[PDB]
Design an enzyme around this catalytic site. Structure first.
Site, PDB file in Angstrom:
ATOM      1  N   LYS C  86      64.502 104.489  44.709  1.00 27.78           N
ATOM      2  CA  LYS C  86      63.982 103.429  43.862  1.00 27.78           C
ATOM      3  C   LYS C  86      63.495 102.277  44.735  1.00 27.78           C
ATOM      4  O   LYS C  86      64.230 101.786  45.600  1.00 27.78           O
ATOM      5  CB  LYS C  86      65.049 102.962  42.871  1.00 27.78           C
ATOM      6  CG  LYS C  86      64.500 102.103  41.763  1.00 27.78           C
ATOM      7  CD  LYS C  86      65.586 101.602  40.831  1.00 27.78           C
ATOM      8  CE  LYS C  86      65.945 102.636  39.779  1.00 27.78           C
ATOM      9  NZ  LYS C  86      66.668 101.968  38.658  1.00 27.78           N
TER      10      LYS C  86
HETATM   11  C1  LIG Z   1      66.279 101.530  37.521  1.00 31.70           C
HETATM   12  C2  LIG Z   1      64.891 102.030  37.178  1.00 31.70           C
HETATM   13  O1  LIG Z   1      63.940 101.057  37.615  1.00 31.70           O
HETATM   14  C3  LIG Z   1      67.147 100.989  36.423  1.00 31.70           C
HETATM   15  O2  LIG Z   1      68.525 100.932  36.833  1.00 31.70           O
HETATM   16  C4  LIG Z   1      66.654  99.593  36.052  1.00 31.70           C
HETATM   17  O3  LIG Z   1      66.924  98.718  37.148  1.00 31.70           O
HETATM   18  C5  LIG Z   1      67.379  99.067  34.825  1.00 31.70           C
HETATM   19  O4  LIG Z   1      67.117  99.902  33.680  1.00 31.70           O
HETATM   20  C6  LIG Z   1      66.989  97.622  34.537  1.00 31.70           C
HETATM   21  O5  LIG Z   1      67.769  97.237  33.412  1.00 31.70           O
HETATM   22  P1  LIG Z   1      68.330  95.747  33.188  1.00 31.70           P
HETATM   23  O6  LIG Z   1      67.148  94.909  32.749  1.00 31.70           O
HETATM   24  O7  LIG Z   1      69.356  95.883  32.086  1.00 31.70           O
HETATM   25  O8  LIG Z   1      68.876  95.383  34.548  1.00 31.70           O
END
Ligand SMILES: *[C@@H](CO)[C@@H](O)[C@H](O)[C@H](O)COP(=O)(O)O
Ligand SMILES: *[C@@H](CO)[C@@H](O)[C@H](O)[C@H](O)COP(=O)(O)O
Ligand SMILES: *[C@@H](CO)[C@@H](O)[C@H](O)[C@H](O)COP(=O)(O)O
Ligand SMILES: *[C@@H](CO)[C@@H](O)[C@H](O)[C@H](O)COP(=O)(O)O
Ligand SMILES: *[C@@H](CO)[C@@H](O)[C@H](O)[C@H](O)COP(=O)(O)O
Ligand SMILES: *[C@@H](CO)[C@@H](O)[C@H](O)[C@H](O)COP(=O)(O)O
Ligand SMILES: *[C@@H](CO)[C@@H](O)[C@H](O)[C@H](O)COP(=O)(O)O
Ligand SMILES: *[C@@H](CO)[C@@H](O)[C@H](O)[C@H](O)COP(=O)(O)O
Lengths: 223, 223, 223, 223, 223, 223, 223, 223
Positions: C86
């Site tokens: 990521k």
């Molecule tokens: C990774 C994909 O990009 C995920 O863990 C995202 O960081 C989260 O879904 C972001 O969610 P929040 O806005 O609740 O931190």
């Protein structure tokens, strides 16, 4: 739709008013500091704009705290009845708008970027709300869509706060604002000047002039 | 659009009232029972909210039978003229609403999940009807669609019951409620505070004050 | 549509995997730091998740510079073939994605908030792009509208990057994602748990059990 | 669109199969227990339907636990190749569906009330999913909207699970299912028989019959 | 779109066949009994149409019972390979259609007034289905909406049954059928003749004629 | 969608390519004369851009006459295989495009302001067509509407000419182009740089970094 | 979209051919009779256009009876393989079109004013059908709506007849024809020349050449 | 909707006025110079039109400077109370309109090509604004879309300036203007003459005359 000029340049404000197409002016601390160079004071610039413009002149407080905002706002209001106090969309800004509204001082809530912020400012009694379409365009959302939603919301509740479209970058912001029904646009001078112009207006005027020379050599209309 | 705070927490209510953007409060037995711990009693909480909030304050009956609801509603009404009696959408609740409406006791029909329930509450004379958008979202149907249908139905028949959007979970429930034209939203404190905020407001404010430092060393607006 | 679990909590991941409805996992530095407390180390959490989950597991780099990102991404890749790196939507992140994509290392571009950022990430060759719907809801913009535009853009250009809807807060984000045709949603555990449930499912099951008791007092089906 | 009969009444099934418009049958614990009276046993009723109906015959498990559902499923399967095992939308049911599908036993996931439940059943490999439109109508939401969403979701992902519209109450559920494109409807016998009928068909037949007695007294077509 | 003539009048059919724009013929007991007057027998009429018309000729059974319909259908089939057996939308009619389809005898289901009846006829294997738009217009329902829905339904299921719009009363039934995409229309002779005509066609020819008289008084095109 | 940089500034072109997000460059005589100052020759600038950019580089002829255009075009083509000859939408320009297309020299028709001009350029065989959205915005028409119509026209006739949106002023021109499905956008550097950025990306990165310091003091990912 | 020139004037045809944007020519007895004055004969005009134009050249018969039309059509065909025989929408014209289609003589059915006329011409096998948009406009109906319906009808049935939009009066007939997807427009010369032109093209060209004079005194591009 | 005649030809004006369907006249310098040939003077043409036409007559100034425009406008005004001063959309023209409007001299702003120019003219107080639809059609933009936007803008702000559709070329400009709700159209004489006519009116009149001849050989109605 009222059209304001979004500048603190006195020459631009003079020329725009001399076209009869300018209904007021908006400023902010950036636009003022641009003109407060080489001996020109910010205080004189504000007073001069208030003098030459008959319509509303929006002038922004610099304090971020409620007491400083209401104090600066009362001073701005004292400079002339056309002064409108520009106040950012913050917790203290909303409190200041409510107090000033009760004191019958006209207010303009600035730095608005979504329709609910705009609604909160209207609930506080603000005279104008200024959503920033160009800065939304910059972050990859069509800013005019927020204007459309504000117009619908205000229509729904018969809200009297005027929608003042700001951060305008191009003549299509202006056209879309008018089709939506925004109360006011504020435009930079370069945009203002372009609103009057069209290439077919130029061409048609040139052609009519040439046609008339076949009937009047000196180009006059003798009646 | 009116904005109520959906909580029994005294400090959240105090804070949101002091902001000038909270027009009332809704409570329910769960919210109150959360604050009625470590000594505090539910009667003090209810009386204390009624004192802080000039606008409507909705307080839910706990009896499920007509006679108990009507007796509790009269006692709630006795606590102050701004008290509004929250009554569930049941057969006994509708009977109670009709009786209380005739006694000029303001009412709020709660636990509403479709438009026809809301219509029945309106026909019984209820002052507010509270459809629960978040709990519909939880079960896989877009709760805001029910608000839109209720708005249309109420417009069709010139219904004076106010739509009070409840079970609100995020600022888009609030946006869509305003675009639809709901009369009221009730929001948890976390949601309320987010409504004023936007990163571009923060960015733009910080930039304006930086610009102003170029013409005013002490960051003041002297006029 | 694939459904990933958006947590670093190993007990939640174990439970969802045992239900059979979890196709992968997304983590981020906030999620991981929440679990690596009171002894437990971050490298151990990541490794245990890689072991439990047969599907993709997204692990975010921490460096902000191209060189550090690629170095971290290779160590992530080396932990198991199901690891996905990521990477934030930044200038250095785009360069890192392009390099890792050429190395056949699967990538997930994160912190995406409009459709053009998502397009840029797809042009760098990213495996998955993660627009954050809930964080847009927070700032007063319907985050699902960005998902709809990305789907249309990706359809136009036959883009193979998968749309991974992230920052999901409720089951209507999930419903709308499926109707739009997003490739993946990643959901927190309390959202995941609600997706299977509906009160009429519960009610119908209870009723069918009572019906069966009439023709079979023990409650079994003997064929 | 396939048309199934939603009954365990053997006379209705025979009558409908005798018409050439019935493609299969669905049952449930209620439908079976209604017929298992006066010394009639549920096992004979099921076996009789299987023998008479060429097409799929859906028979519902009564166990609520994974292992009991899989064990009942295999016994249902052993009753005939056309038997389809009806399994409720629960965590245990999804697990049972995934096991049976890998054993090439056809399944039908029932008690579905929203589109995401339907998608989860498709992701477990279910042969049919049965959203209940009439029970949604009963609670004040247009059940056909759920079918429309499921059709779009399944199209988006090229899902091979067939949409089996259930809890059908009137011929407009049927018409709307066909216009949407549902794969299957299952209908009670009274609905089935009404589908062939229209007052203008009856009136047209009678007029043509009277027109024909002008040219042929005995009512024959001699060719 | 194929175009059939809806009549039993030999002179109308002969005239329309001369034009090269008639693709087939439909009849019914009312039409046939109108021409079987003053010593003309219906058996003669049917044979002469079969001989004149290269394409499909639809001829309706008169029995209402399955055995008689199938028997009559076989006599009709024997009269010529272009014979299509017209059969009413009834329980015996669907049974006869299915039997005749299996015998490779082409069939046309008539007296259809809604889309589900059309679907049922298609499921029985019918070659053509004839909804009656004019008779729906007569009872205050826009008959063309039924054609639209049948087109959508047949498209959803890749149904091979051809839609044969019948009971046509005016050229706009024809226009709308073509815009919808119906496979065939059958039209009375007065409608058919009108379809070629338009007053601007007539006006344009006369004027082109006059223009050519300026160049060639002969009225010829000598090349 | 390909993204070109609309500049002749070598430093901008270097930086944009070093982000891997630039697929080519467009120039014109204005942009080139901007950089051909203080001893820098236009001929060296063109050769340098062709050297450093791997993708197409659009270079405009200056002659207005057909012979001069084809002569200049062959010289431009000789400088490198990535050179694309930019040619204005005039009668002589179209003739030159046709000749050059037959010589397998890639062409870009520029100064296009409506969809029919674009179609004529495609009919001449042009490789790219460049409608000028910003200059349409300047004259009070939404330039993106012309892009939408060109896309539809080109789709209708399976036209292989690529739509190259030019005169882009803001990121919403880019977003709308991508949603419409334009083949290419060409953007000034300032616009290019803004496409990557969003305030919530900045904020989220800052927050993740702070969260990770609770688990790793030095901000590294040690795996 | 193909663009034909709608004239019998040799110099207009010569000029438009030399531009490379004229794909064919349509004539009619009025256009030809305009050029057949002061000595010139209609046969020379027709033969001379056939020589200049490589594409289709439509030439109208003057006989109104089937036999005359077929004889004139064979003589027209004899003049060159690119000749297309223009025949009016009448009963004899349709018969002639069907006969000529079998002889592989290309045809163009003219004087078409609604979509069903166009369909009948297509069913007779015509190569092109020419609906007259300008003459519909003259009588108060938007002629382009007929083109849109014909396009839909032809798409529905995969009809190979080309739609040839005729009686074209302005560049918006041309724009809308292209957006609809008509196969061909035929335009008068005045219309054709305007299609390439736009004031912003003229303004932008003049400005670019002025800019270039700042770096190239003699206005040349030396590479 | 008012219908004006757009000509300086006195014979056309006399004829249209005698028909009773002409509510006013517009002229411009091209139109006037066309008539003032071979002796006839422009001042005499203007005066004769003012005399013949009871309604508004628009006469355009020739000066381009504010002072000359106002001087010419006063001489125009003085010729008769029905004279309207036509003034081009320029900076000096807006100033002139504002001055003349304050003098209660009716004005008509001309050479308008987009909705924002029309808004500016309305803000200067102009009596009529004249967007040119046909000149926009010429440059490939549907001119009627500008009329639609102006109507919406004027409706939004309750603007009293009348929309005077000009540069009209065909009866569909007129039809669309009326459907939009424009206040006035001005039409050339050949367009005016067509507005009354329809071939089915002519055909129906001829038929009704023949019908009457049956019951009255002389052709009169004796009551
Ligand atoms: C990774 C994909 O990009 C995920 O863990 C995202 O960081 C989260 O879904 C972001 O969610 P929040 O806005 O609740 O931190
Ligand atoms: C005041 C609000 O009405 C105005 O001066 C605004 O600050 C500007 O219009 C904002 O424009 P920029 O985004 O260009 O600063
Ligand atoms: C009373 C009705 O307005 C409110 O207190 C409601 O009970 C809540 O808004 C319901 O919200 P939850 O679904 O979060 O309990
Ligand atoms: C099995 C699933 O297709 C069916 O028998 C369903 O249980 C019924 O269609 C449900 O109908 P009711 O709502 O009438 O029980
Ligand atoms: C047979 C079916 O295509 C046809 O002859 C129909 O009976 C007629 O088209 C029905 O027309 P009427 O409603 O005018 O009888
Ligand atoms: C070439 C065409 O693809 C480009 O360089 C165009 O000339 C410019 O994009 C036009 O932009 P401006 O309107 O800002 O000159
Ligand atoms: C032949 C058919 O394509 C053409 O020459 C037509 O006759 C003309 O296009 C008709 O135009 P007018 O209505 O101006 O005669
Ligand atoms: C005056 C109203 O502005 C009119 O005479 C207009 O000048 C003409 O209608 C313009 O028409 P043309 O484009 O045909 O000159």
């Amino acid at each position: 739709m009222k059209i304001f000029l979004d500048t603190a340049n006195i020459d631009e404000i003079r020329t725009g008013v001399n076209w009869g197409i300018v209904d007021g002016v908006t400023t902010n601390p950036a636009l003022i500091s641009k003109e407060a160079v080489n001996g020109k004071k910010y205080g004189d610039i504000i007073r001069e704009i208030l003098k030459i413009v008959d319509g509303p002149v929006s002038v922004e407080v610099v304090s971020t705290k409620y007491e400083g905002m209401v104090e600066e706002a009362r001073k701005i209001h004292g400079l002339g009845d056309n002064a409108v106090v520009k106040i950012p969309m913050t917790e203290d800004g909303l409190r200041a708008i409510k107090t000033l509204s009760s004191e019958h001082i006209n207010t303009n809530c600035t730095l608005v970027f979504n329709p609910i912020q705009a609604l909160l400012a209207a609930k506080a009694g603000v005279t104008y709300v200024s959503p920033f379409v160009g800065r939304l365009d910059d972050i990859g959302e069509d800013g005019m869509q927020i204007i459309d939603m504000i117009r619908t919301i205000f229509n729904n509740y018969i809200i009297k706060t005027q929608i003042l479209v700001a951060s305008i970058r191009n003549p299509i912001h202006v056209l879309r604002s008018a089709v939506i029904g925004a109360d006011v646009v504020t435009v930079p001078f370069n945009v203002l000047k372009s609103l009057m112009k069209h290439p077919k207006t130029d061409e048609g005027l040139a052609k009519f002039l040439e046609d008339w020379k076949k009937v009047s050599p000196d180009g006059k209309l003798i009646l």
